[PDB]
Subunit: 388 residues, 4 copies
């Protein structure tokens, strides 16, 4: 087998079709489904799998009480087959920790997990299911990474890390790995003022990451990585179509090199595909809470600060809870181009639903089509009443 | 490996022997068995598996309440090993939707699922476990397909779709796929007046489909497809041995090019093997409800409008519930000929058994023998009392 | 790969060591373990597995009520990994029926299941997980076979069938299969007066079967099969060490060509290894019920009607329930000789324990050693109280 | 494939990172997790797995009542995937018994289980999942072995056995196996006065074992094995840093060739890595009970009777229960050196927590890093209240 090379461009995106859905909370009502959060999707050359951070307990288990908690010693990055629920019996543990990333380079899979206390966290880099390299905290304030898949080109896999305050200036680094070993790291450069939880995809030798400004911005920071030169730039999506949550209402002029103001000290992991006229943005429908999800076709959103939507598709109704969202692609599919995909985390439980004492999620997943397909909406589908 | 070619004919069918039975409802009384309906069977070159449409919940789970419902966002086409029950832990998801078909071409498996609202449904074609082609609704009225396996010849797999009214003229299309890509489609031709849920099998370069007239007929429409020329004809089974449900009593003269009247706006998925003197028809024993199942040897049923049974075998007693039935064959078995097989869906729960609030099924499956074997009857075997 | 040839002899048997134990009833108290009976063990070239007849329900499931019943449509021959319990999720179904046999020929596995009503039963022969041949009842009175593994030599696998009364003269046949196809069958010959449930093993081109006389004898009938000439002889074990159950007390003179009298119309499946001075017999400790199990070294038991034990080993205490027992060997192990093995069925529930309404079993399994090893006793270990 | 050779040395150990954690007791609160004790970790060339002695029951199962019991017929050595819990459905049984060891030689895995009554125990040696050799008790007093992995060099695998009193002089033997067959055994030599439960690792053609003196010593005996000459020596760790439990307080002078006094007739399985200046010792934090665990860097602990710690890392807080600990290494990882690993058994239930009637454990596992990583603490994480 061989190192994957990013030689293709994105397929024309004319709509989105259903790709995967696990119905985890529905099924977990009467089965041994693991409590999770921060899910994502990542492909191997022969298989696509769901990924998430387990809480080391099932939903019906009494230890699910208090799983709104983010970081603990009982968390672990798990993977399981596409569209099946994350269960005790069908889940494979990749590594131990409460923040993670993962990707296949064509030959083997690299997985990274971060664990530890807030002032002494450390990352372990696994490659081919063995631990290979370790990274200590450099700012002693919750070392953390992407919570979705990384991308590899010719065996080189860039990973975005952040260490420091979640609500002020922090220390963001881009690490370049090959076979789990560290080739290089560099401090964040460019005009982006704060970076959390980057969603990445690869196209024609370039890697694009769409991130979360948890400090002052409701526009999304963007990191463009050159995986061959191992260099990067950063800015914001210039579009006045704001895609963080919570967020102000859409203005008529966006900001390219500074945060759009109005909401401080919060955000949500999100994604975008930035491809000239083929540009699609995702966001929650609500401007106030993590409910609803929609895709919006915004031509040149990355560079045009007046750009507005010309097409869209609803993924989750506003009346239904959403959550994190992120990008992935099957880089080993057939065809001349890469088909854009994404997932949406459907959070159930706390804080929004405090009749139960747990927090979990299920997953819905979509891929692009060149057809103009009809749309549906994909709620989690569980009824809280049944869990009382 | 290679594309399968339909070079063989049917084996002489002298009786039927038991092939598979999963006892899903019995076992699901105390295990994590998924609620399903619309099951079928399909073989790979190395394995035969059960298939069905899951409801995204187990039977004991509270979310099984209301699963008489046909189309929802929690449904998915699943497969699992022959004669095992469909459980949360042993089931593999093929694709997401509430109407489906699937077949192996010798090299890889094609699976098709349809999802969406009634006026905006769309089909996704998977090949080798990756999405490859999409089809939008053309009549905006529940785009739907076979609910049993398709058949492939030299990499070409015909699939019958219907879009439009279930109780009047509708738009039926035959699609021809190769490696998941669309080669051709054509509107329904011939004398068949309404097509639903075709059951297909392949023999000596020809593909035969037996379908359901849900509009006016209680005789079954038949589609004969040429997979090399990618053309087809259609008519009804001429035999006065009527095989839909519900249905009038058997007359002495059948109809070849028009529906046999008496029952409107209903039917059931069924099958037949049409092979001259080796012709066998399946049907429910009751003329009023989905109970009982029998096989009847009706020589030249396809072309002879006076033809009557000369041999038979009871599969399910009239006192026991049945349901959908359909055809499949192991095209990779040894021997000079293909052995005819079929399955019967054994529906339990609503509407017929409303003490419970769920609807599910188990599967019984048979194959042909050249021996004259003794017969048994194969009920689902669950006791509703235990579920109260 | 190649057809296995019986070129080796038995290893010297000086004692027995523990080989496998599944603790099914213990574990099944709080897990989804399938109710079973008639278990056995059979090896592939790369794996050894447990086999049994499932009842299509778990032990905790309410449908376990009445599973003392022998023949039903919910039974199936299942296999699962050595020393694990037979669970819904880890069991593989081989075929459907209520009497069975199975063996690997070196290339692929043949499995045979019999199903149907008492007067119309039929056997289906599976080879390489596909149905290949069918056999109708010839005496219309519960067609039945070995309930333990068959043995193959150069692709030829003899199987002993019985059809007719269980308490009088019946029609016993030896079938010779190759790749699931029937080469030959012949009626029972020799001095054995009644044959049920043969336990077989292979040595130096010869196949030895030890059976159950359910009519008048408490000595065990023996069938010696030549798999190359496809011929056989039969007689009884001449030894006064009687090994059926129930049975008279041991006399000082056994019978070679007629049943030893005193107990009519009952018996239990059992086994022996007949190897001159290396001869070991198994039997229940009790002469009245299926409790206890012991191995006895009885030199020339097959031919010497005065022969008595000179060594022994207790397997199950008399205070503990036993059941069927049978022989198997790993014909693909390393070494110059075949090591003798056996299993004992540990029946729990009805009729002996009627506080519960179910009947099930677990398995204990032993193999021979050339060392003189210490002995233990291996009870099932479940407590009935917990199931109330 | 090939026999592994111990050609490498240990990597410089500057700290420890998290490797694996199964959270078995947490998860087992509402899932079918097997009750276990005496766990360990062992690697194949392509996979690392958890190992433990099952009690033949799940934690929620009523048969978990009384599982503080050490030796019974319902115990078995099981293995399951790294960091998953030991469940009924995902566990593989290696062999039957209540004391065990296991290791891969590069080609295949050898597993050894001991079973039987106290005065008649015997070991069965499995190789490539088949039984190959048997060893009878030589002192008729609980034949017992390592309870963690053995190490192989060029196909030769040394295993340390003990037979006789646990609280006085006993008969310890070192067995040398190849492909499961016995090459040689020799009685214990050197100055070590009592040997139990050796933890072993391999480095540059030498095998080091750290054991438990259950008689008079609170310093740990050490066995150094030459696997090529098949010879050994023994002594104690000279360091005044005492690593058994319970134990006196640390003095300023240790003992090299005799037990350090103060605590009799007890101990705990433990480990050490003895590598000159790269020497790390493990021990419980408490001197009185099995709570807490810490690693201490003690230069030349093996030979220097004045040596004291110069660096350390806390693994489990003193407020949390610990248990057995032992060594393992991935001998098939990439790099010029072997990375030291270990596990800690986290015992929950009896005797320390007698509100429940069961005894079980979970596992935490660590590996060495050349980075100076921040430390966390890794408790089992279950709440006993939930099990009442
Ligand atoms: C079966 O399925 C199909 C396939 O899915 C369904 O068809 C889909 O239907 C949906 C819903 O209608 C469509 O999504 C919307 O698309 C519009 C954009 O399309 C319109 O506008 C285009 C651009 O117009 C401008 O530019 C052109 C220059 O070329 C100029 O001509 C024009 O005058 C104008 O200047 C048009 O080109 C386009 O026409 C085309 O499409 C028509 C069909 O749609 C067709 O008839 C035409 O012939 C032509 O082919 C069309 O007119 C998006 O604007 C819209 O997104 C807004 O609205 C949703 C609510 O629905 C909202 O959630 C979005 O966030 C967004 O609204 C916010 O953002 C704006 C920008 O910032 C802001 O200005 C708004 O005020 C609003 O802001 C507020 O809400 C947000 C959200 O909380 C908040 O953050 C803010 O702060 C503020 O509070 C939808 O995405 C699909 O495009 C369409 N797909 C296809 C293929 O047709 C079909 O309906 C189904 N059938 C059935 C029976 O159900
Ligand atoms: C052990 O197992 C074996 C193997 O399974 C068992 O043997 C099987 O037994 C079953 C049950 O008896 C048989 O099934 C029935 O078969 C008959 C057909 O066989 C008969 O008819 C043949 C044709 O006769 C005509 O043509 C010939 C020309 O050659 C002419 O000679 C003759 O006079 C007549 O003109 C005969 O050839 C055939 O003879 C052969 O077989 C005999 C044994 O069967 C043997 O003795 C002979 O020597 C010779 O070898 C035989 O006489 C089917 O007709 C029948 O199906 C009808 O009946 C069932 C109810 O049992 C019903 O459910 C069916 O739907 C059907 O009845 C409906 O359809 C008709 C056609 O439309 C209609 O006219 C009826 O009025 C009826 O319609 C009503 O009900 C339906 C259903 O709801 C409804 O829709 C309608 O509207 C209306 O309300 C059975 O299939 C097997 O063939 C047989 N197998 C074998 C290999 O023998 C054995 O019994 C078991 N042993 C034990 C101890 O249990
Ligand atoms: C640690 O583990 C080891 C290894 O397992 C344990 O050692 C084992 O211990 C067991 C139990 O003691 C032994 O099993 C018994 O073996 C005897 C046979 O061995 C004796 O007899 C031999 C033959 O003697 C005759 O021939 C020779 C000619 O060479 C002649 O010299 C002699 O005088 C006599 O004529 C002797 O060779 C043999 O000696 C050897 O072994 C000795 C140790 O055993 C050793 O000390 C010697 O130096 C020499 O090396 C020995 O004396 C079996 O007969 C016996 O089986 C009977 O008894 C059990 C009950 O225990 C019963 O269940 C059996 O069914 C059987 O009894 C029935 O069958 C008879 C035949 O029909 C009948 O006559 C009886 O009346 C009885 O019938 C009644 O009960 C049955 C059952 O319900 C019923 O069906 C009937 O109708 C009727 O009601 C045992 O199998 C192992 O052999 C032995 N293994 C080894 C390697 O030593 C050790 O004990 C453990 N240690 C500890 C501390 O626990
Ligand atoms: C983020 O994570 C990092 C990484 O983990 C954290 O950093 C770690 O912090 C821990 C905790 O502080 C450290 O573990 C302790 O290490 C000390 C040893 O280090 C000290 O001593 C060294 C040796 O000093 C001697 O020799 C040198 C000669 O070179 C000489 O210079 C010196 O004067 C003296 O003679 C020093 O070299 C060393 O300095 C280095 O490290 C410093 C940072 O640690 C740094 O500042 C320096 O510049 C230099 O680089 C340092 O001073 C261990 O001694 C200690 O272990 C004892 O204490 C724990 C309790 O904490 C106890 O459980 C242990 O069992 C042990 O105590 C017992 O054993 C003794 C020996 O027998 C005995 O004498 C004691 O009385 C005691 O005995 C009692 O308790 C036991 C236990 O029950 C019982 O059995 C007895 O009977 C009796 O009752 C710790 O292991 C790590 O080393 C350190 N790692 C690193 C890389 O720095 C960091 O804290 C985290 N950050 C945050 C914010 O949380
Ligand atoms: C420490 C700041 C960080 C990103 C803003 O908080 C995240 C936000 C979360 C959220 O907004 O739901 C949940 C994340 N699990 C959490 N990440 C970590 C490592 O705890
Ligand atoms: C929309 C008409 C269609 C065929 C008549 O209804 C079917 C009949 C069913 C039935 O008769 O039981 C159940 C099918 N799940 C359903 N198919 C869909 C797509 O909903
Ligand atoms: C027989 C002495 C032996 C070592 C001291 O006891 C062990 C100590 C144990 C313990 O200290 O927790 C549990 C072990 N399961 C047990 N080993 C056996 C074979 O029973
Ligand atoms: Ca923000
Ligand atoms: Ca109809
Ligand atoms: Ca008898
Ligand atoms: Ca001690």
């Amino acid at each position: 087998r061989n190192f994957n090379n990013l030689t293709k461009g994105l397929c024309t995106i004319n709509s989105w079709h259903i790709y995967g859905k696990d119905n985890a909370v529905r099924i977990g009502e009467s089965s041994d489904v693991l409590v999770t959060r921060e899910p994502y999707v990542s492909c191997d050359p022969d298989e696509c799998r769901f990924y998430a951070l387990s809480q080391g307990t099932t939903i019906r288990g009494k230890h699910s009480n208090g799983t709104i908690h983010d970081r603990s010693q009982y968390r672990a990055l798990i993977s399981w087959p596409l569209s099946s629920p994350p269960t005790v019996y069908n889940s494979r543990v990749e590594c131990i920790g409460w923040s993670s990333t993962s990707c296949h380079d064509g030959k083997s899979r690299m997985s990274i997990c971060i664990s530890g206390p807030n002032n002494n966290a450390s990352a372990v880099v696994w490659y081919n299911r063995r631990p290979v390299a370790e990274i200590n905290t450099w700012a002693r304030n919750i070392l953390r990474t992407q919570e979705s898949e990384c991308v590899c080109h010719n065996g080189v896999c860039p990973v975005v890390f952040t260490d420091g305050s979640a609500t002020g200036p922090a220390d963001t680094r881009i690490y370049y790995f090959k076979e789990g070993k560290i080739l290089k790291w560099e401090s964040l450069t460019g005009t982006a003022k704060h970076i959390e939880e980057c969603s990445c995809y690869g196209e024609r030798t370039g890697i694009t990451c769409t991130c979360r400004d948890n400090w002052q911005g409701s526009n999304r920071p963007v990191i463009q990585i050159d995986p061959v030169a191992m260099t990067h730039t950063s800015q914001y999506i210039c579009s006045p179509v704001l895609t963080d949550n919570p967020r102000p209402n859409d203005p008529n002029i966006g900001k390219c090199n500074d945060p759009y103001p109005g909401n401080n000290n919060n955000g949500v992991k999100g994604f975008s595909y930035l491809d000239g006229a083929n540009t699609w943005l995702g966001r929650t429908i609500s401007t106030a809470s993590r409910s609803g999800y929609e895709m919006l076709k915004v031509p040149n959103a990355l560079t045009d600060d007046r750009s507005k939507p010309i097409q869209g598709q609803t993924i989750v109704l506003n009346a239904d809870w959403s959550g994190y969202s992120g990008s992935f692609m099957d880089y080993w599919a057939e065809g001349d181009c890469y088909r854009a995909c994404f997932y949406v985390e459907l959070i159930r439980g706390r804080p929004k639903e405090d009749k139960v004492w747990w927090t979990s999620n299920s997953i819905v997943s979509m891929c692009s089509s060149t057809e103009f397909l009809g749309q549906w909406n994909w709620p989690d589908g569980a009824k809280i009443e049944y869990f009382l």
